[PDB]
Amino acid sequence: LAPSVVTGVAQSSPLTIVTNPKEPRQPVPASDGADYLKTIPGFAVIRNGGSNGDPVLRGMFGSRLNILTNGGMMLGAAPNRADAPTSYISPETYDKLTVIKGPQTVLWGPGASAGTILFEREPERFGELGSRVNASLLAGSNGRFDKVLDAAAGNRLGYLRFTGNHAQSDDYEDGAGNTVPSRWKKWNGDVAVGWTPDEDTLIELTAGKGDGEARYAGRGMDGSQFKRESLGLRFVKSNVSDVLEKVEAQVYYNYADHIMDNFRLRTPDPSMMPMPMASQVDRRTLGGRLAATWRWDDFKLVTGVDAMRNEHRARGSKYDMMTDYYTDADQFPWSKDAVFHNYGAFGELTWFAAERDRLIGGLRLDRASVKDYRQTLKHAMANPTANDTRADTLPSGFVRYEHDLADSPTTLYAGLGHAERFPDYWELFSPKRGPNGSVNAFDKIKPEKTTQLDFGLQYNGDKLQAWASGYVGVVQDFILFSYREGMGSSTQATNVDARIMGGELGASYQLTGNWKTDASLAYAWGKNSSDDRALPQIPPLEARFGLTYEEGDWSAGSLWRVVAPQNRIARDQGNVVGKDFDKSAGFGVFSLNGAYRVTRNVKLSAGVDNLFDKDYTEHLNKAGDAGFGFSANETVPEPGRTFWTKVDFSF
């Protein structure tokens, strides 16, 4: 029971990773969804500024990742993806994080081409009147503090629970002594009312809001509001019969209301946005899920349907140059531009054939649709697709086979999976051109259809615990973005065919009773088959080595992160956020941490991130901004040396 600081999370079982987001983590996260993925091999993070990075899994970006909060979806609204889904998610407020790698599940919605990421909160169940609380307080270099509170009280016929957080940090500095434009502020508060009329039933009401700020060194505008409101309803009846083992039903409402501007966290420079300017955009998502679990004999079957509708609006500021009067964005009416629908049916079937063999297969069928509400485009021109609808029905599915060896505690696995994903908001509305000879992006961007083989192994010995996961795949009609400066600067979305391949592996050895040593490796590769080029924004080879000493009451450990250069890039190509420009330099970062359990109710941890004050940037981080004094194409640098300490109470 020696307490530790997390520097990496293992594959505890084929393709799936499970972690507790309320334990301290070595390179210390913002209150950010993406930063809590940095400990899971396979993930990289596009740096935008201080917080709210854009997470990338085995080279893949964006909606190729299903990131659900409590089974529900939270979608932001900036055409920038300045408020990416994970900018609204504060992971210390949830109880469990779970990553399913590859297109190997169909329970959690459509388009899960790269992987599935589930943040969830667990129901409370008192057996009598009682009340537990969990809190944490953290403080660190450059004015970072994070405060989180999880309090609940109840009895056997119900409970009520409050979960909140407050977190911020000033601008950090790099390994060369410069202030990076990067400060941020975040808070959330969500309440849950839970009714438990017997030992099998649970109805839960949930409501919560949150807001935040964030200065972005990588952008021309900052996030001055990340307002979120959400509602939810859960139903869990258990053991309805000998065969129906669970029936779960849920509905969710998430509303995002974002503001980008160039005057509240910065000042307009000379550069093609010299005037004070702001843009307010919002996204209203409503959806539900309904699933029955059948368990009998050697079979488990999960059957269900789900649905989702979401709607996007925008409205912008207006600044008069003769009078220098600024009219804020909220003085103008809302302009709807997009509405999306998805309805889907799914099943997934597991066969427990003997104890050393399992075979899992799953299928789902989705009907996805979108309607363009833009009467005009922006000087305003008439929108050639104003009020057009497109739809499509996309089947997806997978089979996976897991076999355990007879002599050693080893599990081998191989799975083959197919994902079909209707296009994004950002892939359909944000690009200023479609494929060549096309009206718009909206009418010609084809859905992305990826087909991939997953394989790997698990091994759990007494002194050794190791895992490996490799993949090779093709992506048909990959949605790629191309950048050119010309009038001004503009993107074009196209559909290409892509080969991709890579993997991750990790191992932990227990040397002494007190010494542990772990390591992990992550490799991602991509090729644009249609132009005999490499795929853009692909993170380079990355290993992490770690040694820690435990002693019952406390623990100390060190960590080395080592990343190769990246030499395969596709210049002026990427996603809606970033573009490849230059090859990248390798680098190494070494860090220290420690943890001490003061008593059963209080724990202590601390660490030094980047001990040797390395000045370095990651291949995926955004470029500079010129307005912030950034050069030719300097990508935003990582933090330099940083100190932090955190106390955890639990009664």
Numbering used by the authors: 14 to 283, 285 to 392, 398 to 505, 507 to 671
The authors write:
Here, we show that Pseudomonas aeruginosa OprC is an outer membrane, TonB-dependent transporter that is conserved in many Proteobacteria and which mediates acquisition of both reduced and oxidised ionic copper via an unprecedented CxxxM-HxM metal binding site. As indicated by the successful structure solution, OprC contains a single bound copper and shows the typical fold of a TBDT, with a large 22-stranded β-barrel occluded by an N-terminal approximately 15 kDa plug domain that, like in other TBDTs, completely occludes the lumen of the barrel. The copper binding site comprises residues Cys143 and Met147 in the plug domain and His323 and Met325 in the barrel wall. The CxxxM-HxM configuration, which coordinates the copper in a tetrahedral manner, is highly unusual and has, to our knowledge, not been observed before in copper homeostasis proteins.
To obtain copper-free OprC after purification from rich media, we constructed a variant (OprCAA) in which the binding site residues Cys143 and Met147 were both mutated to alanines. Even after equilibration of OprCAA for 30 min with 3 or 10 equivalents Cu(II), no coelution with metal is observed, indicating that high-affinity copper binding is completely abolished and confirming that the His7 tag does not bind Cu(II) with an affinity high enough to survive SEC, possibly due to the presence of 0.5 mM EDTA in the SEC buffer. The OprCAA structure was solved by molecular replacement (MR) using Cu-bound OprCWT as the search model. The binding site residues of both structures occupy very similar positions, indicating that the introduced mutations abolish copper binding without generating gross changes in the binding site. Superposition of the structures shows that for the remainder of the protein, structural changes upon copper binding are confined to the vicinity of the copper binding site, with parts far removed virtually unchanged (overall Cα RMSD approximately 1.0 Å). The largest change is observed for loop L11, which undergoes an inward-directed motion of approximately 8.0 Å upon copper binding (S3D, S3E). Some loop tips (e.g., L4, L5, L6) in OprCAA lack electron density for a limited number of residues, suggesting increased mobility. In the double mutant, copper becomes solvent accessible due to the absence of the Met147 side chain (S3D, S3E). In OprCAA, N-terminal density is visible up to Leu66 (i.e., the first 10 residues of the mature protein are disordered) including the Ton box (68PSVVTGV75), which is tucked away against the plug domain and the barrel wall. The observed position of the Ton box in OprCAA, likely hard to reach from the periplasmic space, would prevent nonproductive interactions of TonB with transporters that do not have substrate bound.
